Amino acid sequence: GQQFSWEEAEENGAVGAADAAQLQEWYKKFLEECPSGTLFMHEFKRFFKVPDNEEATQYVEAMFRAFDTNGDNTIDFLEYVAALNLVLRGTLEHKLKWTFKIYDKDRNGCIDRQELLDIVESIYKLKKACSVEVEAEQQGKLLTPEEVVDRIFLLVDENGDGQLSLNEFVEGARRDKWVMKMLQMDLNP
Numbered sequence: 001g002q003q004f005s006w007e008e009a010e011e012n013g014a015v016g017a018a019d020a021a022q023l024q025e026w027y028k029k030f031l032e033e034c035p036s037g038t039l040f041m042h043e044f045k046r047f048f049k050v051p052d053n054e055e056a057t058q059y060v061e062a063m064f065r066a067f068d069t070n071g072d073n074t075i076d077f078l079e080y081v082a083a084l085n086l087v088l089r090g091t092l093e094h095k096l097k098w099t100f101k102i103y104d105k106d107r108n109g110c111i112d113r114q115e116l117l118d119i120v121e122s123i124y125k126l127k128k129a130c131s132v133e134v135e136a137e138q139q140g141k142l143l144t145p146e147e148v149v150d151r152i153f154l155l156v157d158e159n160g161d162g163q164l165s166l167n168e169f170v171e172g173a174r175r176d177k178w179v180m181k182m183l184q185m186d187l188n189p
């Protein structure tokens with residue numbers, strides 16, 4: 001399927017512009033020390049944020065999951081790079097789709113309170129092993145791990161159909177009243 005690189009390289013002998021140039025170095029700096037060197041969920045989390053407590057692995061592990069879905073357990077240079085443009089540089093609304101996918105842990109085309117508790121739960125383990133404990137209790141009235149889920153579901157939804165489709169979430173994630181800040185997690189810093 002597809003190829004071993006971008007369509008540009010396939011046709012064009014060396015593409016052009018400072019575009020590929022930037023990638024030429026990336027593709028080389030990574031494959032230079034290893035011909036046909038592919039990345040792995042482990043080599044990624046490491047060569048990227050190489051954390052320590054590891055706890056902050058659930059979050060990243062998700063990234064590779066939502067992005068690396070080909071089903072080969074491996075992620076070639078191409079895939080990775082694609083993610084960058086989707087995050088590194090300015091990110092357009094295209095995020096509404098990719099993010100909606102991050103939650104899709106069961107792969108079915110529909111999101112359910114099951115996926116909500118899954119991802120959020122992950123975001124919790126992250127902010128937990130971070131530089132703060134946000135002492136759930138004394139900190140602004142804590143809640144149950146299932147509460148937040150029922151909060152993002154009800155708000156994003158409204159018909160009570162019992163199913164959170166893309167369009168439903170997309171529009172419910174385009175602005176809402178708090179879905180962004182939360183689901184966003186990073187925000188900017």
Ligand SMILES: [Ca+2]
Nearest residue numbers: 068070074075
């Ligand atoms: Ca892959």
Ligand SMILES: [Ca+2]
Nearest residue numbers: 104108110111
């Ligand atoms: Ca799903």
Ligand SMILES: [Ca+2]
Nearest residue numbers: 161162163164
């Ligand atoms: Ca619905």
